[PDB]
Every structure is written in C-alpha cells, then in structure tokens.
Design a protein around this ligand. Sequence first.
Ligand code: ADP
Ligand code: ADP
Ligand code: MG
Ligand code: MG
Lengths: 697, 697
Amino acid sequence: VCVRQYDLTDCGAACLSSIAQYYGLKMSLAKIREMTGTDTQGTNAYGLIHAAKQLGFSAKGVKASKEDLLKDFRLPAIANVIVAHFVVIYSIKNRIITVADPGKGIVRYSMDDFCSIWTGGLVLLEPGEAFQKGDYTQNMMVKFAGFLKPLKKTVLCIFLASLLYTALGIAGSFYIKFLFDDLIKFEKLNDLHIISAGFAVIFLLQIFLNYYRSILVTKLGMSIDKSIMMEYYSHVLKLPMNFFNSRKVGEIISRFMDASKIRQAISGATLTIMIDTIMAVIGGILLYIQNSSLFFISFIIILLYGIIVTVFNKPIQNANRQIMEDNAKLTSALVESVKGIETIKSFGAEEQTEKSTRDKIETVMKSSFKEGMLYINLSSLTGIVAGLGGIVILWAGAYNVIKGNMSGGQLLAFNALLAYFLTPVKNLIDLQPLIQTAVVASNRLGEILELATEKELREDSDDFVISLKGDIEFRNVDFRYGLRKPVLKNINLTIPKGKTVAIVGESGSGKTTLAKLLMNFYSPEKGDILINGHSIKNISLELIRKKIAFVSQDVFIFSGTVKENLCLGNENVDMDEIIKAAKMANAHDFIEKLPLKYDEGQKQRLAIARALLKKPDILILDEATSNLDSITENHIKDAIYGLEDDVTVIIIAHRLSTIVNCDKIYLLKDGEIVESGSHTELIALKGCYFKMWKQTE
Amino acid sequence: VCVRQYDLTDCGAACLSSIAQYYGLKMSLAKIREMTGTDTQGTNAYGLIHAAKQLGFSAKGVKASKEDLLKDFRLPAIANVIVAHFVVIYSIKNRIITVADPGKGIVRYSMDDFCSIWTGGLVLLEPGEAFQKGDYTQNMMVKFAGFLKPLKKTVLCIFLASLLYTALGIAGSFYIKFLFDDLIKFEKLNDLHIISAGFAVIFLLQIFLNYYRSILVTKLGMSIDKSIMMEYYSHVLKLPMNFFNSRKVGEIISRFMDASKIRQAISGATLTIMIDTIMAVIGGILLYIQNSSLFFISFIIILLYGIIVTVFNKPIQNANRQIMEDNAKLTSALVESVKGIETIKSFGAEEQTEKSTRDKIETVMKSSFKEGMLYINLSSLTGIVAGLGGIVILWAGAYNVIKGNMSGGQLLAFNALLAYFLTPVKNLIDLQPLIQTAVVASNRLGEILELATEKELREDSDDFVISLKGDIEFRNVDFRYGLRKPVLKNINLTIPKGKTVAIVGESGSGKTTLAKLLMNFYSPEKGDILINGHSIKNISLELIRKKIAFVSQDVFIFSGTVKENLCLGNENVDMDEIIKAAKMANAHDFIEKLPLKYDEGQKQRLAIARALLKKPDILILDEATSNLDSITENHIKDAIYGLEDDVTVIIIAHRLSTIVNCDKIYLLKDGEIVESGSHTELIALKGCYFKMWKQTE
Ligand SMILES: Nc1ncnc2c1ncn2[C@@H]1O[C@H](COP(=O)(O)OP(=O)(O)O)[C@@H](O)[C@H]1O
Ligand SMILES: Nc1ncnc2c1ncn2[C@@H]1O[C@H](COP(=O)(O)OP(=O)(O)O)[C@@H](O)[C@H]1O
Ligand SMILES: [Mg+2]
Ligand SMILES: [Mg+2]
C-alpha cells in the first residue's frame, strides 16, 4: 500500500498512513498529519515516533548503515532519504529492495544507490496491544454527492431533455434509409420534399433541446461548485490556530480548484453515466434489430477502443507527472539565475549559466517527447481500430446486402446508429482520467472538513460570567510549538486589575506567544490560566475574543472601507465613539489629512484605534508604540494611561526607555522570568534587568 | 490606439506609445519603457514629460478641474487615474468622453465617474519643430519564422507526407461510391473482397503516413521552441543592470510561455496554412467535378461557419478577460483573508469574511455564466449550420439523383469528400485565436531582443591596461536611479593603492550604491571615475569584472557543488588554490565537516572564500563580517589586514566599532562626505564622526 501525498510537507504522515493501512488501520490523512505535529517544515524525526506510539505502534528510532540492512528487520519501516522526504521500505529480496515513496509510488532500488540516498536515520514500528483494527474514514464522494438532494428538479429536467434529444436524434438518423430505400428508388419528389422538411424540423427540435439541456447543466454545475467552495471556506475559517501556522497559503488555496474538479465530476460524470448507459442500451437494441453481425463488429470495435484507451491512459499520466517535475525544476533554476543576477554578472560567468539552463531545457524537451510519443502511439492505435472497424462494417454490410439479409439504405442507417451508439460509449469510457483526479480532489478537500473546530474543542462554557474582571494568575505553564523546542517552562505571575503592566524582553524570548496564550490562542499543555478564580478553559470562547483586544507588531488593514476596519468585529455602532477613538488614538487628524472621508505608522495607529474601540477588559500591545514618533509616543502613553472602566493594560516592549511609568514590570530572558517589580525597585534590586538597563543607555 | 500593456507596471509607456502612434511615430514599447525610466513601482508624470520632450514633443504637466474638461484644449492627452493607472483621452463629445486604456482597450466614460476616478494630474503633449516621423520596428513574426530557414529538409519531408496523406484519403473516400454504384447492384463477391482489401491497405498506408508526419512535426516544434527560448535567455543574460532592477522576476519568466506560444504559431499555423490550402483546393476541384450545386451549398455552409466563428470569437475573448480579472480579484481576497487570520479570529468577524467571499464568488460565477452563454450560443449556431447543411446536401443529392444528374453512390462519395474538404477549411478558420495571441506574444518577447546590451553601450576599450592596481579617484559625481531623486551629489574621494580603506555610514546613505558604481554597474551621468590615471569608461568591461571581487550585503548561493560555486567564474582552477581560499576565510573546517568533503554565516563565509579565490586587484565587501562571531571576525580581520600583491581592500560597515585599523575612514551622511582621514586624525577634528561614535557607545 502506497498512499499518494497531497502536499509537499506530509511525506512522513503519508508513510505512517501506509504502514497503518498495511497493518489494517485506515484513518484520515489529515488526522495523522495533525497527530504527527507536522509543521510547514515537516516532521523531522520525533513526530512519526510519537504518532505511532499514540496509535499503538511500538515505535523506535535507530541509525543504521548498509551492514545492518543485510541481517533482518521488520518489513514495514520508514527510511529517511534526501532524494522533507521520507521513504518506506517493504521487503529485502536477492540484491534488490522495494520502496513506496509518496512522491512516485512503489519503485525498486539497488543497495548502492539506496545507501547513497538513504540517510542513516531509520524508524522501526511494531503494533502493540491496543491496535484494534478499523476503518475510521468516510466515502467523501457520497458526502459531496449528497449536495444533489436540493437540486432534484433541475436534474430531472436534464434527464428528460437528454432522453428526448436522443430519441429525436435516433428518429432523424433514418433519413438516409428513407432516401435510398423508397424515395430515390421509386422517384418520388413531393414525398422527398415533405420528408426532408420533417427531418429538418426534427433536427431543429433536437438543437433546441440541446440548448436547454446545456443551459441547465451549466447552472447546476455553477451552483454545486459554489456550494462546495463556500462549505470548505466556512469550515476553514472555524479551524484552530495550529492548523493555519502549520500550513502554507497555497496549501489552503488549492482546495478551491480541488472543489472545481469535484464539480467537474459530480455535474458531468454522475449525469453522463446514466445518460450514456441508457442511450447505449437503446442503441445496442436498435443495432441488434438492424443486423446482428454488424452489431457484433461494433461491440468488438468498442472493446478494443476501451482496452487501448486504458492501457495507454496509465503511462500518459506517468509521463505527465515526469514532465511537470522537469518543468518545475527548470522554473526553479530560472528563478535562482534571475534573482541573483548581480553576482552572476560580476564574474564574467554569463556563458556558464547559458549552458546550465540549456542542459535543463533539453531535459524538459526530452521528457516532453516521451509524452508526445505516448500520445502519438495512442492516437495511431485508436485511429487504426476505428477506421478499420468502419471499413469492415461497410464490407459486412455490402456482403449482407448481396446475400439479401438487409436492404440498401439500412446499411447507411446502421452507420448513423453506429455513430450514435459508439460516441456515448466512448464518452463513458474516456472518463477514468476525470474520475481518478476527481476522487483525489474529493479526498483532499474532505480531509479538512473532518478536522475539529474551535467551538467543539472547548470542554465547557460558564454562564453567569459576564466579564473577565479579575486577577490574571499564571501557574506552572508549559507551551511548545508543535513538537519543537520548548518556549514556556515555569512562568508564574499575577496581574492585578486596573494597573498598567509592561513586559520587556529581547527578540525570541517568547513574549508574543505569551500574549497568544493570554487570549486562548493555542493551549498550555501544563498548568492553567486563572481569571477571577475561573480558568480560561471553563469560560465562553467567544467571550474571551470579545473582551480582549490584541495588537501585534505585524498589523494590517484589509482592502475595505475604514468604517469596516474600525468596526471589524462589531456590527452595531454609532459614529460618536468612532470619532472619539480616532481622536483618542491620534488617528482623526491622519484620516482628515487623508483624501475623501471616513469611507506603517498609519496602519499601527489604526490598529490601536480599533483595539480601543473594542473597549475590552484586557488590552495587549506587543511591539506597537516603538514605531511611532516621539509626540505620538507620549500622546499614546498618556492616552492609554488615562483609561477608565478599570481596564487592564499590558505593553510588551523591546526598548526599556520607551515605557517607564507602569506599576509593575516583568522581565523574561530565556523562556522564564528572572526579575519582577517596579522600575524603582528594579534599579535598587541588582540583577539582569539592571545590566540591560545599563547596556541600553 | 490602445496598444495592450505587456507588463503590469508599464501603463504610462503604453499610453505614450499610443499617442506617438496616433501622431505617426511607431517604435518598440521596450525602448519607450526604458526611456521613460519605468521602475517596478510604475512611471509618473515626470518620466512621461521627459520622454516626450526627448522624443521631440512639447510635453507639459498641469492640474485640471471638471470645468477644464468642458473647455477646449488639446484632446490627445494622458490623464492620471487611481483604480495609479494612466488612460489617454481622445475626444470629449457632447456629454460623453472617449478614452483608451491599455488594461482593457478603448471604452467610454461619464463625467461623474471620470471625475470620481480621474486624478487632478494631467499631461499635455504636442509635437515640436524637430519631430521627423519614422517606423523603428520590425515585423517580428518574420524574424521568428526565420528560425525555419536552416530547418528546411524537415519541412520538405512534411509537405510531401501531407500530400501523400491527402491523396490516400481522397482515393479511399471512393470506397462507398464503388460499393453502391457497381458492387452492390451487380452482386459481385470476389471483386468486393479484393476491393475492400485494397482500400483497407490504402487506409493503413494513410495511418502510417500520419504517424510519420506527427513524429516529424513534434520534433520540429521541439527544436524551434528550444532554439527560441535559448536565444531569448542568452540575450537576457547580457542586458545592462538597470534592466533587472526595473522589472519583476515574473515579467522576465513569462517570456518562456510567450516563446512556447510563438512555437505553436510557427510549427502549427505556418505548416497548416499551406497543407490545408492545397487540401481544400483539391477537395473543391473534386467536388465541382462531382456536382456544382452541392459544391455551392458546401461553400455557403463554410462561409456561414466562418462568419459565426469570428463574430462570436470576439466577445468570447472579452468575457474570458473579464472572468480572469474576477478570478484574480477573488484569489487575492482569499490570500489576504487567510494570511491575516489572527485578527479575524480575535475579533469575532468570521461571519463577515464569509459574506465578502461569497459575494466575490457570486460575482465570479456570474462572469463565468456570461462566457458559458457565449459558448452555448456559438455551439448552437454552429451545430444548426452543420446539421442543416448536411440535411440540405442529402436532400439536394437525392433530388439530383431523381433528375438524373448524378447516380447513387456518387452522393455518398460527395459526402465523404465534403467532410474531407470542410474539415480543413473549418480548421483554418479556427486559426484566428492563434495568430492574434501569437503576434502579441512575439512583440512582447522580441521587444527585449533589440535592447542594447552592456557591450555595445561601452564607449571604447583599452589595450595597454592589464591591472587595476593604483589610486582610485572619485571626482564630483551625480547619480540618480532612473528619474528619481538624486543620491550621489558631490562625492569626491582618493583611495591610495594597496591601502585598506573602511567606509561607514547610516542605512540608506548609498554605500552599496557607491560600491556598485565602483564595479561599473550603472553609470554616473555627471562626473567620472579614475583608475590609476585612466577613466573607468575607457577600459574593457570584461577586465573590471575579472579584477574586482564583490561581497554583497546578501550573498546568494546557487544550488550545486561547492567546487562549482567557488569556481563560478574560472573553470580552470587547481585544488590547492581552493584549499588556500578555504583557509583564507575560515572555510576549510566547515566544508570538511559537511557530507563527503567538498561537495547564513556559512553561506557568507563561503562568499568571502570565493572572493579571495577570485584573486582580484580590488576587493569590496559590505556587511561581510557582521554575521560571523567575534572569533571569526578577528581571524578574518587579521587575515585580510596582511594581504600581499598590493591588493586594494574596501570594507563597508555600519558598525563603527567593528573595524578600527584601516588607514583611512570615509563617512557617508547624506549624499556627501563630511570628513576623510585616519581614525586618530578624525576624532580630534570635532564633527559628525565623533557625534556618532559617542552616541553608539
Ligand atoms: N509558527 C511557528 N512555528 C514554530 N515555532 C515558532 C512559530 N512561531 C514562533 N515560534 C518560536 O517560538 C518563539 C516565540 O517567541 P516570540 O513570542 O515571538 O518572542 P518575541 O515576543 O520576543 O518576538 C520564537 O523563538 C520562535 O522560534
Ligand atoms: N536595486 C535598487 N534599485 C533602485 N533603487 C535602489 C536599489 N537599491 C537601493 N536603492 C535606493 O538607493 C538608496 C540608497 O540605498 P543604499 O544606501 O544603497 O542601501 P543599502 O546600503 O542598505 O544597500 C535607497 O534610498 C534606495 O531607495
Ligand atoms: Mg514578537
Ligand atoms: Mg547596503
């Protein structure tokens, strides 16, 4: 078993899923990727072992060389290679090895190239006692096909239109039979004109029916695609924060074209399967009515066509993958050569780059020629089959007319019905490329939809609490981004109400993450956060996001009106508080100076303006005031100092001299606090804080 | 004139070129884009007026109002607009205006909407006395077709194959005529078998010829594509430095897809025009031999098909452009929403973003349904034409058979030849959305090809200058990045030969820019650079880059072997030189530790190792020792202090305390040196240097 990887960072998750499927436990790849703690850089070593231990495998890690591979080990094992890429071995045969990488699939390698590419790192697994076999996944194609239930009247008006269109086409095919058998032979003119007019009318009706059906199909496809995309986006916006920072932007954006492929499947394949099977049944019945031998020839033709189509469909996909890889490599080389043009030019080495790029463009050409050869061979074989079958059908029809089994224009009518019967069947046959990528996209999109949401991850919510008014107590708290190095170790503190507090430290100390946990982004793996005697996990999640304002060092303004920006989370406000906050946060003058009306420093002041407009109980500013001018600095200082309604205010800063006038100062050096107290006490109490104060002046 | 913009940042150049073409002066768009001084941020009014004045126009800039638009003045003018875009107005008629924008084309606007979008800035253009007209452009389709001149045996080996394929198909299309006219009527069996076998053999020969022709066509296309892309890349890697920093990477990479489109034009259109012309001439002659009225009916059918194809081809292109724009807007919205999820989650506004995304998705769906309706109308009209024409042809053939003008199977033979004649003409008609998208791509790719490179812009080389050792003189020099504000104003320096020099200053002063001018990158418009008594512009450019080493503020390392990255310029280097270069800048221990032996701090030390491997006359390094620790700092400092062979060394730093022991220290404060001298001499003379030293300690 070799499960194809969906992205470029889930190689280890794919390998672990393959091992689990081999051992009889099939589960969603998204759940495994979340369990391995995979980040944008991938799971280095520890994620696979931890996830296997959680799943019941007796995981272990060992560094082995070519000598260890000779003796023995368990057949399912993950081997680290350097081509964020892991490869799983399966067996050791006579001087050959087999590997099923997510990138390519089940392939075979020799020992020498293996040790050339396989890094000594090795992971061994073995199922434990708690390894109950099961199938913890759902057929996603059925789930997305369930979207057709509301659209059960547009589908019906499409099936009936298809039935009537095919009936009209079959009825109109017999024009050539009526021409030669009765009209031409007996020299009828008025009947000729009447019958020709009738068949023209039939064809016009056919065209109008096709127009109606195409309009309905387009509308249904658009509706289904929009529904799937909106569902995916609405579920994405609800996912926890550990889902976003562990994935790239493109990793989340690709699911829109995945949904487009899903629509291409459901709108097209589901309808055309029934349409083509019923039309093919009608066509085969009619062909058998006309003549049995010619129908058998047609059946042989279509069987050969299908066999050839699939047989050449597989390597065409392989060659397309190869040419895509080569084109990606060439584009990367071009990017590297263009974005570093300065050093290339200031060496006289332009001639070398031309040869280096030619050696890759030639590789791209030689990899495209393989796909061209496959396409040419497939087209030649299909053309041979179709043309020779048509010629043989004409031959057999002529022979049968000679023997008087049929009569003249019956052969031409059979040719028309042959086209009308072979086109639907070949359209049904050449659907495997569409349905395969459709299933791939459906699984890829439905993996995310099974992820737990923020609201349901909460254990419970309190009712009688209305505000976060209470001392902020921090017991022994531990936090680590995924399975990486720890950041929070033994941080213990107490923030009183209504008193401004400044936390100061250097870059990388773990202050922004502390603010993150302060407002329920991520969770502390150890300890608890107490507010007014109540834990942060036992209160309403939406309440925390409503009574806590947060302004970071990377603030931004969305591409929209300023009124929306200042009321991003609030929908019912009046302009009085908006104007007050604009004056309060030193932003009304900026907007008035700006053209029009209320319809990096500017972005920052807008950020504190909206944060204060939120009117919270806790107001957090991490690296915000340092990007303003001195006049704005002191204005913001005295403005945030004179805040009513007993609002707790926290400023995290990297410059000591910027903020001086708080009641209590916290300092964090290496994932922990060393000193805590007022600036007057901090100067008297000799410590690291005094050293940084001296070095900063 | 509304010539399309080939880049997203060259709108102003496009309007200027449109004005010039409307006034009778046509020239390449790349020449105007480099002439206007267009940058990555786009052009402004000053660039437009400067370029127009240099071209001979009496350009001017003025700010107008709504009432000014009502007044009569020079109608052809460029009007600024913020969506910062540029649109040229052509006429202001009675309560209506006419404009032409490169983004869309030529459109009309209303006074209210224009005044809402049009910025007050306005540029007026008028030809001067010396405005001799000209056409400084080449028909670049012919130049790219000239790539077929050496490959003329393959073309002659494809035309003959096409002729033989045509003859075989035409001969084999008479099988149905032979069946019904004589064979079926007279009840011949052995003759039937023989004739059918002969026609099957003819068809097999046709298939083999098609296979051979396809192979040849694929090979020809691959060769043409490779040659064109190689020529374009080799020309690009020679252009001056101002070309790369005035463009985006994608704006230089998309030319490869442009070359692919060019190949699709040359390989497909040029061959198929002749092939289908001969095929259609023969088919039409044969049809006229069979019957005249049916041939006229076929001609009318193909005329209707062509008319419909063009008439619906234009708005299909318009709708495709609109839907592409809507998709770009939607994906930008998704990216900006998903890369700023922190504030969205900590504001409670998950629902609002869903509403905005759904609105944009609905807009995209509507813009896609427009094109769907266009396609459906085109397909329905084409199907009506084809089917009704086939029915009419059958009707007319039956009537002719009744009237004794033709006979039976001749009508079926006419149908076969009718297909064989209509398919080529209806495939040549479908060539319209190939030539347009090929000519635009050819112009876009080939405007670059005529840009003058570094070598031709050089004034004159020298013969007796072999070494750059000597005094470096910087007379009063001016330097502006294109047409922006000046940076280099009055920098006059004297660097003694073989003496280490340190240059210090603030960020954005122009230290790296000065280093760039030193290596002949760009050119000072006023002033000169003197090397040991000789101007820099009088030396061969290959000599300067071969004798000056650069260590930039951000060295990049191209993927590959470290031996190749150290021998980037010279391909003939011994091992011991590499060893001593690695030992020259603390590189041997790091490289020997890596896998095998020789195949940010590490990369930058690698860059310095390469720099001393260049064994130059002048060695310039900026921000080269900052990332290394104090041990490596002092080691490299003592290593570079005691250099031999009279090597001039310039070290540019922003930290004053990093470098102390250079002979002379230069300070860059604001486009001017405030003092020059040794460390001890400059501190005694109170000034800027002492102030910054005291403020940094
Ligand atoms: N998305 C992430 N993935 C992995 N590690 C992270 C991520 N974000 C932050 N970290 C790590 O956690 C630490 C958090 O420190 P931070 O709070 O940013 O310090 P400061 O507040 O002084 O900037 C950083 O040192 C960083 O290495
Ligand atoms: N590649 C470039 N293209 C155009 N302008 C530039 C470029 N690099 C720098 N500049 C401009 O030149 C000025 C001087 O920058 P400089 O002192 O060279 O920066 P640094 O020393 O950090 O390289 C800057 O204000 C900047 O706007
Ligand atoms: Mg931070
Ligand atoms: Mg610099």
